Structure formats: C-alpha cells, structure tokens
Amino acid sequence: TQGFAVLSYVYEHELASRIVSTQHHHHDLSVATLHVHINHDDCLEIAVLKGDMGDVQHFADDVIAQRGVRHGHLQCLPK
Amino acid sequence: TQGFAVLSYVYEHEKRDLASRIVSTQHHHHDLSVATLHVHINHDDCLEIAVLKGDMGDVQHFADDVIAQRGVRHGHLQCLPKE
Amino acid sequence: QGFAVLSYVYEHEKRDLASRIVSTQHHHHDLSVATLHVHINHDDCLEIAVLKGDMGDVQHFADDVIAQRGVRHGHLQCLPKE
Amino acid sequence: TQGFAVLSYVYEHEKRDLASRIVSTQHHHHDLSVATLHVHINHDDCLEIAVLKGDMGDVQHFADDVIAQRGVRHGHLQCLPKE
Ligand SMILES: [Cu+2]
Ligand SMILES: [Cu+2]
Ligand SMILES: [Cu+2]
Ligand SMILES: [Cu+2]
C-alpha cells in the first residue's frame, strides 16, 4: 500500500539533532516538516510523509518510540 | 518599523552542535518566530525556512546571528516591512 | 491555553469549499500560527494548520473547518497547556 | 542545472480566482512543487512560501509566472542550484 501520512510530535530540543538525523535516514519518505517553537523548552513538529505505508510505520517508530518524544500521533492516508 | 520576514538557510544536520545551536537561538528569540519549514534536500543537507515577525531591526540582528554560525550556508533574509 | 494541529484533505478546484476554508481561517487569523500545504494528487490538497489559543475557541474554529461540505479526513490534535 | 528554490509572495485571499490559479499551477507542475507554507498574516493578506525542486530554468519560469499575476505582491525567488 502507498500513500501519504502525517506524523506529529512534541519534544524538548535541548534530541532535535537526533530526530533530524532520524528523518534523513528515511529522507525519500519525507516531504517536509513544519516546526513551531511552542515555548522555551518544547518543540512541535509535523512531518508529512509519502510512500509505502510499511516504511511509514518504521519512520514513526524510530521517532515516536524514542524517550523524550511526547504527544506522538500518526495519521495514514493510503491512496 | 514592524513586519514579517523569511529567513532561509542550508546546513549539514550531522555537523550539528550547530543544529542544536540553530534551534536553541530560535527558542531564545521565540517571540520573533512564527513557524519554520524544513526540507531534507539530500542525505546530508537541510533547507530551513523560518518565518519571523516583529521589529525589522530585531529581525535583522537575529538573522545575522544565525547566518554567522559556521556551517550555516545560503543564509538569506527577505524582509516584508508593514505597508 | 494551548496549541492544536488541524489536518484535512480537500479538492482545491471546489471553489466554494476552498473559499470557505481560507475565509474561516482568516476570520480567526489570531488563532492561526501557520499552515503546511502538500499536493496529494491532481485534485487533492493536504493541509496541516497549527493553531494557538483558548482550547474552546480553537476547537470551535476547527469544527467550523471540518464541518464544511467536502472537507475529508479532518483531524484535530488538541495540545492544552502543560 | 538541477536544484531547489524558495519562492515567496503575498496576495489578498479574497482574490479567489488568483488563489485558485496559484494552487492549480502548483498541481499542474506537481514535480516542481515540494510543499508550501501559508501564513494568514492579517484578515486580508496571505504570505506563501513555496519550496520548489527541479531544473533551474523550469523553476524560474514557474516563479516568473506566479509573480507576473496582478495582485501578487512582494514576489521573491531564492535559487539553490545543486552543489
Ligand atoms: Cu523548536
Ligand atoms: Cu533535514
Ligand atoms: Cu494543493
Ligand atoms: Cu491566508
């Protein structure tokens, strides 16, 4: 199954480097990411992903199952 | 003078006590920040586009500080002062 | 009192729908941070809007978007102040 | 020359035919359009930042056409050719 997906999460940046590195390990899955600096400590990120829905879960696992990542949510949009 | 601005730049996410520093200064100045768009342009390089809002002088000074970090390339500020 | 992530899919060529979505968003521009738009296919757009403010106001605003005829896959993640 | 580019511009959202044309052109050139960030800067005006990818001739021709529409203001292009 192919399609798009939306992966949102909150984290304390002071981890930011690890998450970007994690996304690049799957960068042909990534379309773009929106980042909002919600307070001095916390970041809100929303990554839009495109491709195989199995690759998507692996991306989401690598990000969401990390310590420090909160409020994770994956929405899949299969074709 | 108030307004908006678009600050863009490219950096290497591995060479990244820099990555930590870029996000850290945005947070120190988060009153200026609206939102940032990040595109992974290849395995090594990140394009970031930071939309800023506030006093154009403060925006300029902030942007210069970001661009002056070793490893930030293609640093570019487009100012949109209020009409 | 918090943030939220509003995400939805719609057909951009639907003139009344598209006009209504952006019109509601501009009426509540004070509750809006920024929106990411990605083109899904020839017909369909994916938008992700980050919202900020009172959770009541933010939810009512999101409901006004999601209730529009033609908005698909509408989803709201509320992120109340911690 | 392949690469990326950052195209930014401002327009009034009440110009519905202009708005529809901007998005329809992005979908027409879907290969060129990566993603777009939109900020509702006030009740009337929109700021959009489109990230583009492709041949720099194609990207610049696309940007010209957007900027050439009456009602598009503050049109700006930053070209990032492949390094
Ligand atoms: Cu942040
Ligand atoms: Cu990156
Ligand atoms: Cu679209
Ligand atoms: Cu707008």
From Swiss-Prot, chain C:
Phylogenetic lineage: Bacteria, Pseudomonadati, Pseudomonadota, Gammaproteobacteria, Enterobacterales
Asked if Repressor is a keyword of the record, the answer is yes
Query: Does the keyword Transcription regulation feature in the UniProt annotation?
Result: yes
| Portion held of the full protein | 51 to 132 of 133
Give a short account of what the protein does: Transcriptional repressor of the nikABCDE operon. Is active in the presence of excessive concentrations of intracellular nickel.
Query: How does this protein assemble?
Result: Homotetramer.
Q: Which cofactor does it need?
A: Ni(2+)
Q: Please list the residues that bind Ni(2+).
A: 26, 37, 39, 45
Q: Which UniProt keywords apply?
A: DNA-binding, Metal-binding, Nickel, Repressor, Transcription, Transcription regulation
Protein name listed in UniProt: Nickel-responsive regulator
How many cofactors are bound and how?
Binds 1 nickel ion per subunit.
**GO BP term, pick one:** response to nickel cation
Q: Which family does it belong to?
A: Belongs to the transcriptional regulatory CopG/NikR family.
**Which residues are connected by disulfide bridges in this protein?**
none
What GO molecular function annotations does the UniProt record carry, in alphabetical order? core promoter sequence-specific DNA binding; DNA binding; DNA-binding transcription repressor activity; identical protein binding; nickel cation binding; sequence-specific DNA binding; transcription cis-regulatory region binding
- Which species is listed as the source? Escherichia coli (strain K12)
What cellular component GO annotations does this protein have?
Answer: protein-DNA complex; transcription regulator complex
Q: Coiled-coil region(s) at which residues? A: none
